[model samples]
Target: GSHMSHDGKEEPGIAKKINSVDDIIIKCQCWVQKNDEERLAEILSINTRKAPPKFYVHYVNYNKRLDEWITTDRINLDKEVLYPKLKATDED
Candidate 1:
């Protein structure tokens, strides 16, 4: 082989654009306050201006009044583990 190497690395998603919250913080559920299970909602917007950014979201079926904001740490609770690791190794 002339030019080939396999040292694995990773680059994060979500840099500037709101490209995909398909999973942000998503079209998924949040920790509805230590309840039986998380509820369905969407992270409508983000406020990174604050030290600990805030996430604005509303319940899937409920009214906008039911909307809420979650601190950074809270996102850790609901932010799911997406696209797992893969191998860069090759076989002959």
Candidate 2:
């Protein structure tokens, strides 16, 4: 779990600046697409039981960072904006 840096004491990286809903969605979508591509490639590649997959994987790391970002900032926004929309759709 990566936490935000307040003067680089606890962590080395700074929190991402998500100015609006667009920023949040864009960043999230980018990670999702990248991970999906990696997963597809691994699935399609030849499987050798002797050794691990040759492709370099970063999806787990990406997810960890994304989770931290969402929890650290976007959770409140999701509750305020996303939940109402989803609830409305559920009623339809």
Candidate 3:
């Protein structure tokens, strides 16, 4: 059931098509805006999902960074956490 590319790249998960990483970030932030418990539950759900281990780790890292940004930096979640296509511009 598992997969790996001949070039050493890891295959993506089936559920990955459901949401991009940015989408997941936004969803987690929404939960954070409502309650800390909800955010914790989101992380728990991600951890327990039947997916690749590395995928779970990546999500956990994202959750931790978002949590720290909210609490330590006191970022304005509404303004700061925006959904934009992060891309490589011609200049950059």
Candidate 4:
């Protein structure tokens, strides 16, 4: 059985609280201070004990070393498990 459809679910992208940690391995946007330039990113995991919280993410084409913990406010959930393909020998 193979069924294909284009059904859209209306969910807000602005994740400002605990909802940020609820979703993982999902496509999101993190303000690398570059967005006015930030591009798409994938959330690796999130951690916090008390008040402050951060998200560890891998930006597209950026290396593991380039992967950094962005603020909770910086991430915007877009929802997707990706199959990214790239390896830029840029800024490591």
Top-TM-score candidate index = 4
Residue-level lDDT tens digits of model 4 in 34-89: 44765666666676653567777777667777777777566654333333234456
User: What TM-score would you give candidate 4 relative to the actual structure?
Assistant: 0.46
User: How many residue-pair clashes does candidate 2 contain?
Assistant: 0
Q: Between candidates 1 and 3, which one is better according to TM-score? A: 1
Residue range 1-92, candidate 3, lDDT tens digits: 87974756554322222223324443332224324332321322233132322112112425554433232112122322322245466983
- Per residue, candidate 1 scores C-alpha lDDT tens digits across 1-92 of 57776658756333222223334544334433424456655566766667756778676667989888876555434344333234587889
C-alpha lDDT (0 to 100) for residue 31 of candidate 3: 27
lDDT of 4 at 69: 78
TM-score of candidate 3 relative to the true fold: 0.18
**Which candidate leads the pack in lDDT?**
4
**Clash pairs (backbone) in predicted model 1:** 21-24
Show the colliding residue pairs in model 3: none
Residue 77 displacement in candidate 4 (angstroms): 4.0
After superposition, which runs of candidate 2 have C-alpha atoms over 4 Å from their true positions? 1-8, 18-30, 34-57, 61-92
Q: lDDT per residue, candidate 2, 1-92, as tens digits?
A: 89884654442222343434333332132122333242211111221233322212123444533332222221222222211111235553
**Could you tell me the TM-score of candidate 1?**
0.44
lDDT scores of the candidates, listed in order: 0.54, 0.27, 0.31, 0.55
- The candidate with the higher lDDT, 1 or 4, is 4
What is the Cα-based lDDT of residue 50 in candidate 1? 75
Model 2 TM-score?
0.16
Clashing pairs in 4: 34-37, 34-38, 35-38
Give lDDT: candidate 2, residue 12: 28
Cα misplacement distance, residue 77 of candidate 1 (Å) = 4.4
